[PDB]
């Protein structure tokens, strides 16, 4: 009894969290039974575990001896039958052995840990009370109560959930109907930042500005800023952030004034809902979104297994732009196109491989480093197979359309040019040649109106895609010298068993500027792969002519199906003969004032851009300075120039967390981070040091290339400090989970930043300069909240009050200790102290 009770009931006497007690709390007893022999006065050194002497119920005080009788080598145990009395000596017997084992161990860490192991063995302290799980990527979420007396420092007047672009107002937008859902959901991974909180919005703005001024702020070098941003996980945050970020580009960079200004800071969303493009358009085209339909069309018409491949027509018409005849000087809506990304169609395929040939139950993308490399042997091998079982077919065919299509900024994926695993740019993919050739031809030849045709021939079908040449929007436009020596034609089949009859002819119209002209191949499919023609010269043997009307004509002699590691179907591309070594048909954005109330315009100048996604989730880690990506990037700034890369999308530069709780923090891509401002500052990030970063931004700028910052306002990982919140189990939309036990109940989260990281340094730091120069950003009443941002407080330290909630942590429904008689939390706040009866009054 007595000695065991609490030395005194001050906060100082307990390891508590927000003045609550957890099943893992140690405390300071009055005396310690020194070496279970005699009873000293507790000095401030003398902290013992609570469970050593108190138990939530008797039933738990039971497993506790049993389990602890194991450890210390006592060789008794009791079943459910036993009297209280015995359980109570068993435990004192257990305590002596704990001192005698603390003296002889000269510490008490060995116990820190037999305790923990045991807490873990118990339901209410363990995932079991967290079920049932749901389809959240990490199995479940906890939503934090807005109003709890128990945890008032964690209250909030916001935590408005699910305000995606479609649902920004708390009701599905009537305007946009292609996606009939509400267009996203709130909880994605880790600690969900509540971007419906006006103070937080302000802070995202702070952060945005900082990124965009990185050079000035961090290196004092105006030449090292990020030019643009990518908004990550749009469909999982409050869309207010879109007017916020849009407002900022307009106020600080003037993108709304003319295209030249707009294109120098060209920014994108990652927004998957079909509703997000029209949404963004009506919002003023202040950044551009992906073309989701065209991506899907390429995926299914070209990349999928031969038996799951669809017809080719969708390559022409399932897109934001119908490319049957695209003759518009400016497209109705701007966008970027891609076939693969760092996540889309990469990490999927790896998960496919694990699930299929390594771990059957693997969850979401919570892979191990193990599984991954195991997976990559299968994958790299399939990459070279003609019959692919996991990886894409026809990569070159997809890039041929992406790089010649009109009315979209094509984004090339690093991993389609270099190996998805492996040191930065160390190994070229089998497609690097064709892609590079296209990239280079694009600069020289791709310009003008477009026509695409789908023709049924032989036993299958082909499509033709043609670009008329610089400054001919129409088939009848005749243009000038340069028109004559520009344009291109791509011909594609998606069926290895394509056969033309002898009489069959694919008659392509190349445009008025092209009568009676010699053309030569650029790429041709061959039995083993695809053959690239780097100049007129190199292709002298294979010239062919257009006729009187500017038509190229093709025959069984040219077109037939193939099956090799590169092509499953048919690819042919032709270009006019006689273009100057240095011919360049791209075109510069004009400074003429914009008058349509949009910022970005999909015109010839925007089509002149190419975006490069310059990383891979699955890159090797650098073994040495020379291998750091940002080091390598600076050194190869010329290749990108040579490819026509105008916008370099860098990976997120935040220093990665390493808890391993998701793929992101296993391979450290930079989407999982604890410090928003720590861009390789406190230690190198996967890609190099903050200085290596600066130099790579500088290198790219030296070529005039723009550099994009991945803005990640959705979540944060691995917060160092604990906090107690009032929590509820919820699925990804924030709906309470049926039959869960965690319902408005205290939970200990990892919800606090260190108060002394970069965040502490820069949080809210420029709010003041921002309100001074751009007062209108702070005038706007944000849509979901009805009110402006609130810069009146700075976020110096993240804490649960700025979050919506968190992924379950496996701590349990009863981790915060409760008197079961009264059903009350124990509390150590000094006016209101409430302690386990035995410990205070024995």
Ligand X SMILES: C[C@H]1O[C@H](O[C@H]2[C@H](O)[C@@H](O)[C@@H](O[C@H]3[C@H](O)[C@@H](O)[C@@H](O)O[C@@H]3CO)O[C@@H]2CO)[C@H](O)[C@@H](O)[C@@H]1N[C@H]1C=C(CO)[C@@H](O)[C@H](O)[C@H]1O
Binding site for ligand X (CB under 6 A): 184, 188-189, 232-233, 235-236, 270, 272, 342-344, 664, 671, 712, 714
Q: Residue 588 Cβ, how far from ligand X at the closest point, in Å? A: 31
Q: Which is nearer to ligand X, 227 or 714 (CB)?
A: 714
Cα 354 from chain centre: 21
C-beta contacts of 301-307 below 8 A and 24+ residues apart: 301/494, 302/339, 302/392, 302/393, 302/394, 302/397, 302/398, 302/492, 302/494, 302/569, 303/339, 303/345, 303/392, 303/393, 303/394, 303/395, 303/398, 304/393, 305/388, 305/393, 306/393, 306/495, 306/496, 306/568
Q: Residue 242 Cβ, how far from Ca ion at the closest point, in Å? A: 14
Q: Of 209, 241, 243, 206, which is closest to residue 225 (Cα–Cα)? A: 209
What residue is closest to ligand X based on CB? 233
**Secondary structure class of 745 (helix, strand, coil):** strand
Q: Which is nearer to Ca ion, 403 or 730 (CB)?
A: 730
Residue 232 near which of Ca ion, ligand X, none (CB within 5-8 Å, type-dependent) = ligand X
Residue 194 near which of Ca ion, ligand X, none (CB within 5-8 Å, type-dependent) = none
Q: Residue 188 Cβ, how far from Ca ion at the closest point, in Å? A: 6
236 binds Ca ion (CB under 5 A): yes
Q: Which is nearer to Ca ion, 620 or 783 (CB)?
A: 783
Q: Is 595 left (phi over 0), alpha (psi -120 to 50) or beta?
A: alpha
Q: Where are the beta strands (DSSP E) in 577-714?
A: 611-613, 647-649, 706-711
Q: Residue 699 Cβ, how far from ligand X at the closest point, in Å? A: 25
- Pair type for strands 803-807 and 191-193: antiparallel
Residue 192 near which of Ca ion, ligand X, none (CB within 5-8 Å, type-dependent) = Ca ion
Q: Distance between CA 221 and CA 708 in Å, rounded?
A: 17
186 binds Ca ion (CB under 5 A): yes
Q: Residue 274 Cβ, how far from Ca ion at the closest point, in Å? A: 20
Q: Residue 477 Cβ, how far from ligand X at the closest point, in Å? A: 37
Q: Residue 676 Cβ, how far from Ca ion at the closest point, in Å? A: 15
Q: Which is nearer to Ca ion, 424 or 662 (CB)?
A: 662
Question: Of 133-141, 186-194, 429-437, 813-821, which segment contacts Ca ion by CB under 5 A?
Answer: 186-194
Residue 425 near which of Ca ion, ligand X, none (CB within 5-8 Å, type-dependent) = none
Q: Which is nearer to ligand X, 246 or 713 (CB)?
A: 713
Q: Distance between CA 149 and CA 162 in Å, rounded?
A: 26
Q: Residue 703 Cβ, how far from ligand X at the closest point, in Å? A: 26
Residue 342 near which of Ca ion, ligand X, none (CB within 5-8 Å, type-dependent) = ligand X
Residue 221 near which of ligand X, Ca ion, none (CB within 5-8 Å, type-dependent) = none
List, as one string, the DSSP characters of 568-596. Answer: EEEEEEEEES---TT-----PPP-SPP-S
Q: Which is nearer to Ca ion, 237 or 707 (CB)?
A: 237
Q: Residue 515 Cβ, how far from ligand X at the closest point, in Å? A: 43
Q: Which is nearer to ligand X, 156 or 164 (CB)?
A: 164
Burial class of residue 519 (count of CB atoms within 10 Å of its CB; 0-12, 13-18, 19+): buried
Q: Which is nearer to ligand X, 433 or 714 (CB)?
A: 714
- Of 404-463, binders to Ca ion (CB under 5 A) are none
Collect all residues with Cβ–Cβ distance below 8 Å to 464 and sequence separation of at least 6. 451, 452, 453, 455, 489, 490, 491, 492, 506, 508
Q: Of 558, 299, 529, which is closest to residue 432 (Cα–Cα)? A: 529
Residue 233 near which of ligand X, Ca ion, none (CB within 5-8 Å, type-dependent) = ligand X
Give 3-state DSSP helix, strand, coil % of the chain, rounded to 5: 30, 20, 50
Q: Which is nearer to ligand X, 708 or 712 (CB)?
A: 712
**Secondary structure class of 352 (helix, strand, coil):** helix
Q: Residue 280 Cβ, how far from ligand X at the closest point, in Å? A: 15
How many helices (H) and strands (E) would you count in the chain?
24, 31
Number of neighbours of residue 80 by Cβ within 10 angstroms: 6
> Strand pairing partners for 413?
613
Q: Which is nearer to ligand X, 323 or 342 (CB)?
A: 342
**Secondary structure class of 728 (helix, strand, coil):** strand
Q: Residue 513 Cβ, how far from ligand X at the closest point, in Å? A: 39
Q: Residue 200 Cβ, how far from Ca ion at the closest point, in Å? A: 11
- Count CA atoms within 13 Å of residue 482 on its CB side: 16
Residue 186 near which of ligand X, Ca ion, none (CB within 5-8 Å, type-dependent) = Ca ion
Residue 614 near which of ligand X, Ca ion, none (CB within 5-8 Å, type-dependent) = none
Q: Residue 345 Cβ, how far from ligand X at the closest point, in Å? A: 8
- Of 709-728, binders to Ca ion (CB under 5 A) are 714
Q: Which two tokens stand for residue 556?
A: 């069984």
Q: Which is nearer to ligand X, 233 or 500 (CB)?
A: 233
Q: Of 322, 297, 324, which is closest to residue 310 (Cα–Cα)? A: 297
Q: Where are the beta strands (DSSP E) in 627-733?
A: 647-649, 706-711, 715-716, 721-730
Q: Which is nearer to ligand X, 235 or 675 (CB)?
A: 235
- CA distances to 160, 167, 175, 333 from 164, in Å: 11, 5, 14, 20
CA torsion sign for 724, 676, 337, 567 is negative
Q: Which is nearer to Ca ion, 258 or 715 (CB)?
A: 715
Q: Tell me which of 18, 24, 179, 192 binds Ca ion, using CB under 5 A.
A: 192
CA torsion sign for 168, 733, 187, 150 is positive
**With CB under 5 A, what is the number of residues at the site for Ca ion?**
5
Residue 664 near which of Ca ion, ligand X, none (CB within 5-8 Å, type-dependent) = ligand X
Residue 671 near which of Ca ion, ligand X, none (CB within 5-8 Å, type-dependent) = ligand X
Residue 604 near which of ligand X, Ca ion, none (CB within 5-8 Å, type-dependent) = none
Interface residue list for Ca ion (CB under 5 A): 186, 192, 236-237, 714
């Amino acid at each position: 009894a007595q000695y065991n009770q609490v030395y005194s009931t001050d906060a100082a006497n307990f390891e508590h969290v927000d003045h609550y007690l957890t099943a893992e709390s140690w405390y300071r007893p009055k005396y310690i039974l020194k070496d279970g022999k005699t009873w000293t006065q507790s000095t401030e050194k003398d902290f013992r575990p609570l469970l050593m002497t108190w138990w939530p119920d008797q039933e738990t005080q039971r497993q506790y001896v049993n389990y602890m009788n194991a450890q210390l080598g006592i060789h008794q145990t009791y079943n459910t039958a036993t009297s209280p009395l015995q359980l109570n000596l068993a435990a004192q017997t257990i305590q002596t052995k704990i001192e005698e084992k603390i003296t002889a161990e000269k510490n008490t860490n060995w116990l820190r840990q037999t305790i923990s192991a045991f807490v873990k063995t118990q339901s209410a302290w363990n995932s079991d009370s967290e079920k049932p799980f749901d389809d959240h990527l990490q199995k479940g979420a906890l939503l934090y109560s807005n109003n709890s007396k128990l945890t008032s420092q964690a209250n909030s007047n916001y935590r408005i959930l699910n305000r995606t672009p479609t649902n920004q107002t708390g009701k599905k937008d009537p305007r946009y109907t292609a996606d009939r859902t509400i267009g996203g959901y709130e909880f994605l991974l880790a600690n969900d930042v509540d971007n419906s909180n006006p103070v937080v919005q302000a802070e995202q703005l702070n952060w945005l500005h900082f990124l965009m001024n990185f050079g000035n702020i961090y290196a004092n070098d105006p030449d090292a800023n990020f030019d643009s941003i990518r908004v990550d996980a749009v469909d999982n945050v409050d869309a207010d952030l879109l007017q916020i970020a849009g407002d900022y580009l307009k106020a600080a960079k003037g993108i709304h004034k003319n295209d030249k200004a707009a294109n120098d800071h060209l920014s994108i969303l990652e927004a998957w809902s079909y509703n997000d493009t029209p949404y963004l358009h009506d919002d003023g085209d202040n950044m551009i979104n992906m073309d989701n339909r065209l991506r899907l069309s390429l995926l299914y018409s070209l990349a999928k297994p031969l038996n799951q491949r669809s017809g080719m027509n969708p390559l022409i018409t399932n897109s934001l732009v119908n490319r049957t005849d695209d003759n518009a000087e400016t497209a109705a809506v701007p966008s970027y196109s891609f076939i693969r990304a760092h996540d889309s169609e990469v990490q999927d395929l790896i998960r496919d491989i694990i699930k299929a040939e390594i771990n059957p139950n693997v969850v979401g993308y919570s892979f191990t480093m193990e599984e991954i490399k195991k997976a990559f042997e299968i994958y790299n091998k399939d990459l070279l197979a003609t019959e692919k079982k996991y990886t894409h077919y026809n990569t070159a065919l997809s890039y041929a359309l992406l790089l010649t299509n009109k009315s979209s900024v094509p984004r090339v994926y690093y991993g389609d040019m270099f190996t998805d695993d492996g040191q930065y740019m160390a190994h070229k993919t089998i497609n690097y040649e064709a892609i590079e050739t296209l990239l280079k031809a694009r600069i020289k030849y791709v310009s003008g109106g477009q026509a695409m045709r789908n023709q049924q021939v032989g036993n299958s079908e082909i499509i033709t895609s043609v670009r008329y040449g610089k400054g001919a929007l129409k088939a009848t436009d005749t243009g000038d010298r340069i028109t004559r020596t520009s344009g291109v034609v791509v011909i594609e089949g998606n069926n290895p068993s394509l056969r033309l009859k002898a009489s069959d002819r694919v008659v392509v119209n190349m445009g008025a500027a092209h009568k009676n002209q010699a053309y030569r191949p650029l790429l041709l499919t061959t039995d083993n792969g695809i053959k690239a023609y780097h100049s007129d010269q190199e292709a002298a043997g294979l010239v062919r002519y257009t006729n009187d009307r500017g038509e190229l004509i093709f025959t069984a002699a040219d077109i037939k199906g193939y099956a090799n590691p590169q092509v499953s179907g048919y690819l042919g591309v032709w270009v006019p003969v006689g273009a100057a070594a240095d011919q360049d048909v791209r075109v510069a954005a004009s400074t003429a004032p914009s008058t349509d109330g949009k910022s970005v315009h999909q015109n010839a100048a925007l089509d002149s851009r190419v975006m490069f996604e310059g990383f891979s989730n699955f890159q090797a880690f650098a073994t040495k300075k020379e291998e750091y990506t940002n080091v390598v990037i600076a050194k190869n700034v010329d290749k990108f120039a040579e490819w026509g890369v105008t916008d370099f999308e860098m990976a997120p530069q935040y220093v990665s967390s390493t808890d391993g709780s998701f793929l992101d923090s296993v391979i450290q891509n930079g989407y999982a981070f604890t410090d928003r401002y720590d861009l390789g500052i406190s230690k190198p990030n996967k890609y190099g040091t903050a200085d290596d970063l600066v130099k790579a931004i500088k290198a790219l700028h030296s070529k005039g290339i723009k550099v994009m910052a991945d803005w990640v306002p959705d979540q944060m990982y691995a917060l160092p400090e604990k906090e107690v919140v009032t929590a509820t189990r919820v699925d990804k939309y924030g709906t309470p989970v049926a039959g869960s036990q965690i319902k408005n109940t205290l939970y200990v989260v990892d919800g606090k930043s260190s108060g002394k990281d970069q965040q502490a340094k820069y949080g809210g730091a420029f709010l003041e300069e921002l309100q001074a120069k751009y007062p209108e950003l702070f005038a706007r009443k944000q849509i979901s909240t009805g009110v402006p941002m609130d810069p009146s407080v700075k976020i110096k330290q993240w804490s649960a009050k700025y979050f919506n909630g968190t992924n379950i942590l496996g701590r349990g429904a009863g981790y915060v200790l409760k008197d079961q008689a009264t059903n009350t939390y124990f509390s150590l706040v000094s006016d209101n102290t409430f302690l386990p009866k035995s410990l205070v009054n024995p």
